[PDB]
Amino acid sequence: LPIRNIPGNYGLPIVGPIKDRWDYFYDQGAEEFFKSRIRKYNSTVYRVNMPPGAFIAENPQVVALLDGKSFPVLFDVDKVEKKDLLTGTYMPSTELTGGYRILSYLDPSEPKHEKLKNLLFFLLKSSRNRIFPEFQATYSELFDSLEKELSLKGKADFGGSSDGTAFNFLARAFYGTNPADTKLKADAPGLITKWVLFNLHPLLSIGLPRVIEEPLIHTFSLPPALVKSDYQRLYEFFLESAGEILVEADKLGISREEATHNLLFATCFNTWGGMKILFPNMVKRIGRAGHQVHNRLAEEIRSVIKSNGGELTMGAIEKMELTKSVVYECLRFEPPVTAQYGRAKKDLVIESHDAAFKVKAGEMLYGYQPLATRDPKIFDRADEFVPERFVGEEGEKLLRHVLWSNGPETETPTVGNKQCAGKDFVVLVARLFVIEIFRRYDSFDIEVGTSPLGSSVNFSSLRKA
Numbered sequence: 024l025p026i027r028n029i030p031g032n033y034g035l036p037i038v039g040p041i042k043d044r045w046d047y048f049y050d051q052g053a054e055e056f057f058k059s060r061i062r063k064y065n066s067t068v069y070r071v072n073m074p075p076g077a078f079i080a081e082n083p084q085v086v087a088l089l090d091g092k093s094f095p096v097l098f099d100v101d102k103v104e105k106k107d108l109l110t111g112t113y114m115p116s117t118e119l120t121g122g123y124r125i126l127s128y129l130d131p132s133e134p135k136h137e138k139l140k141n142l143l144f145f146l147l148k149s150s151r152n153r154i155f156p157e158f159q160a161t162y163s164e165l166f167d168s169l170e171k172e173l174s175l176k177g178k179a180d181f182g183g184s185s186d187g188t189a190f191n192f193l194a195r196a197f198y199g200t201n202p203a204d205t206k207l208k209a210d211a212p213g214l215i216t217k218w219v220l221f222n223l224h225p226l227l228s229i230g231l232p233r234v235i236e237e238p239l240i241h242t243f244s245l246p247p248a249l250v251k252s253d254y255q256r257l258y259e260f261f262l263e264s265a266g267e268i269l270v271e272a273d274k275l276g277i278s279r280e281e282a283t284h285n286l287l288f289a290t291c292f293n294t295w296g297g298m299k300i301l302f303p304n305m306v307k308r309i310g311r312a313g314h315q316v317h318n319r320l321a322e323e324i325r326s327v328i329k330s331n332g333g334e335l336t337m338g339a340i341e342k343m344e345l346t347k348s349v350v351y352e353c354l355r356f357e358p359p360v361t362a363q364y365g366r367a368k369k370d371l372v373i374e375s376h377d378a379a380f381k382v383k384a385g386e387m388l389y390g391y392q393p394l395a396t397r398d399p400k401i402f403d404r405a406d407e408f409v410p411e412r413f414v415g416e417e418g419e420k421l422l423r424h425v426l427w428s429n430g431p432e433t434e435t436p437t438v439g440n441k442q443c444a445g446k447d448f449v450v451l452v453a454r455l456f457v458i459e460i461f462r463r464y465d466s467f468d469i470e471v472g473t474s475p476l477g478s479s480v481n482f483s484s485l486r487k488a
């Protein structure tokens with residue numbers, strides 16, 4: 024491939040990044056922000072300023088990788104450092120995380136990365152026999168509540184009930200603990216939401232006019248002290264509920280305190296936060312797929328469970344081809360966590376489709392994942408949600424290009440990489456969600472809106488089996 028100069032520039036000091044920030048949040052929105060520049064520069068690799076800049080991030084300047092050939096450099100731990108960049112060009116204060124740098128911020132060259140990731144691997148494996156019954160019990164209650172609400176209001180707000188369900192499910196599945204039986208009661212979603220906002224506000228718009236938002240959430244960090252007591256309520260819940268897992272932490276050589284902050288983060292930030300985005304997005308995209316697709320999913324799921332003597336098991340799920348494909352297609356079409364960063368460890372030659380680009384050691388690389396996973400040079404019908412995309416031998420080959428977990432779907436998370444520790448769990452629970460919907464309902468209708476973190480979604484009809 025020809026070597027090209029990386030196009031783009033950072034504009035004038037102070038004003039360049041602020042203008043780009045306005046485009047990103049207000050005047051274009053993230054997708055058009057990136058696509059307009061792809062068009063202008065005639066390149067899927069270019070220089071751009073990223074939020075938050077201002078007084079929160081020291082350096083907003085990145086090289087953006089916006090195709091499925093260049094993007095995977097972000098996974099290669101020999102090419103990129105993955106230290107302190109979970110949230111990009113700033114890192115939330117460790118005052119928000121008990122004074123610890125939590126697992127997600129650690130590079131694999133840090134020895135505690137291996138210990139803590141092994142801890143989470145153990146958490147997930149030890150949960151294996153609780154996942155199915157706890158999912159089926161908690162989500163059954165959710166759909167009961169949604170039917171109730173639809174009968175009262177003629178629509179049912181999915182997010183407003185499902186956030187509690189997700190936390191109850193995780194507490195029961197991971198820790199054999201019902202939050203209702205603890206001091207947390209039903210308060211966890213509100214607590215976690217506030218704490219997550221204190222972490223992520225520099226990257227979010229919450230609807231308000233730019234005259235309010237810019238000085239209030241985009242210029243300076245919100246003070247961690249204001250969420251400390253909320254965080255302590257969550258901490259005490261995890262300390263008291265995670266007994267069995269804390270024994271394993273002890274064996275792995277991790278302090279009780281460090282283990283507990285990491286369990287809190289993995290459960291609340293990574294898992295519950297990820298589900299908070301994913302599940303409403305699934306309801307939206309599957310809703311939009313239409314009633315014929317719903318009918319085909321119901322037919323498949325019910326027939327398979329019938330063939331399995333009414334017992335839902337891992338092997339039964341493997342028979343549900345359209346179901347597996349639909350879940351993969353949600354993750355391809357709308358990756359829940361869209362921003363991945365890595366800092367070049369050494370000089371690199373990054374290949375795109377039609378040119379290669381040279382980056383110097385120390386440059387911040389950035390990828391907006393949906394542009395890599397909706398890359399029309401990789402996927403046919405790239406901007407179409409195609410339920411059956413991954414069905415069969417040929418379809419399954421394309422899973423190497425589904426990147427939601429910060430690595431190819433065909434690859435396994437390890438202590439040596441920064442791929443999502445919960446990769447298999449997420450795909451499992453996403454499948455369980457679709458299964459629970461269509462074992463109960465023939466089809467459904469939705470109404471949709473925006474949310475600071477993903478979509479807002481109402482059911483307007485739920486057609487019972």
Ligand code: HEM
Pocket residue numbers: 105108109126127128129136140143144147289293294296297298301359360362363364427428429440441442443444445446448449
């Ligand atoms: C839908 C839910 C989830 C989504 C969308 C998601 C997505 C991601 C992504 C995109 C990353 C890469 C972060 C980066 O370096 O930029 C990541 C990392 C990580 N995730 Fe997940 N995740 C989810 C659920 C979970 C679960 C269930 C666990 C439980 C173990 C988990 C634990 C982790 C950990 C520990 C890392 C950092 C890995 C490391 O340091 O090697 N996540 N996740």
